[PDB]
Design a protein around this nucleic acid. Sequence first.
DNA 1: GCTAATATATGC
DNA 2: GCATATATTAGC
Length: 84
Amino acid sequence: EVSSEIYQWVRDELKRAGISQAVFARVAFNRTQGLLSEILRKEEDPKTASQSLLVNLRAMQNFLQLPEAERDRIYQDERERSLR
DNA sequence: GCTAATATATGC
DNA sequence: GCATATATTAGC
């Protein structure tokens, strides 16, 4: 399942890696910036969260479990990718 | 449920 | 004020 701390963990990660919502939204759960923004604003309790949300949150949780180094390379690649 | 567009906000 | 980032929400 998903932890109710996911929202804090995502906020913690954005700050740590100094990345934008767009970059994280794409690589972590394949969605756009505005969606992540709303997801973060609402901060819905995962226990009353729709299955669509749960899919997005679990995808974010799994991505955060990757090694720090791997997540950093992935962010960098996405930056260059959109840079084009 | 989302994306894409764009009004606002933020870091220099 | 330029370059990006984030908040909003119309249209699919």
